[PDB]
């Protein structure tokens, strides 16, 4: 599965994984959370 | 009369850049500075025209011109350093 390769990548590159995680959060909030709170 | 002064100054910068690029066929470095001078003169033309007419299409396009100027300078110096590697 992809989990082993993903975890090995996170272990070797901490800064890139952290940057991707924060960027994914910052892109997921306005693309998913925003429409569902727009409709209350 | 300040629009006239602005336009004449920009036009003289433009013709001076043309003068610089035309004379020295070999420097290849003054040519890039002259091209930058031409782009600068045109940017001032656009900004001054935008201020005079109270229209915003002049400043938007003037700001977009900077990307072209920077890209042209970067590629120009890349090709320049490639050319210089052959001789000397």
């Amino acid at each position: 599965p992809v989990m082993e390769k993903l975890r090995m990548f996170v272990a070797q590159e901490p800064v890139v994984a952290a940057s991707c995680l924060i960027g994914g959060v910052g892109l997921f909030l306005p693309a998913v959370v925003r429409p569902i709170l727009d409709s209350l | 009369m300040d629009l006239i002064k602005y336009f004449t100054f920009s036009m003289i910068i433009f013709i001076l850049g043309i003068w610089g690029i035309l004379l020295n066929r070999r420097n290849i470095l003054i040519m890039l500075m002259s091209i930058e001078l031409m782009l600068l003169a045109v940017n001032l033309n656009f900004l001054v025209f935008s201020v005079s007419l109270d229209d915003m299409m002049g400043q938007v396009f003037a700001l977009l011109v900077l990307t072209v100027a920077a890209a042209e300078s970067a590629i120009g110096l890349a090709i320049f350093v490639i050319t210089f590697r052959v001789r000397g």
């Binding site: 892109l27 306005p30 925003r34 | 900077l66 990307t67 920077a70 300078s73 970067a74 110096l77 890349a78 350093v81």
Partner: protein, 92 residues
């Protein structure tokens, strides 16, 4: 609204005068490509900052459209920087 730059001009003139009076006190008594590459990356990632500056200030006026256009711009430059990273040209 823009008279506040003449103080900057006078400050600059006085600072130059102070530098002169500071330097005049005793008187009264070969090629590397990597440098070019880092300069190019700085230029490219400085144009993006100059583009960010109007976006951040006017971000309130524009909702879910300017933000996503700037995100597309960032994604394009991120693809560029990813090609930059893997190819090399980023470490010494």
């Amino acid at each position: 609204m823009m008279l506040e730059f003449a103080p900057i001009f006078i400050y600059l003139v006085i600072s130059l005068l102070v530098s002169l009076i500071l330097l005049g006190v005793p008187f009264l008594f070969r090629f590397d490509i990597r440098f070019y590459l880092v300069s190019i990356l700085f230029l490219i990632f400085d144009l993006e900052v100059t583009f960010f500056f109007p976006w951040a200030v006017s971000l309130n006026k524009i909702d879910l459209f300017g933000f996503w256009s700037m995100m597309a711009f960032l994604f394009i430059l991120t693809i560029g920087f990813l090609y930059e990273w893997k190819r090399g040209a980023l470490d010494w």
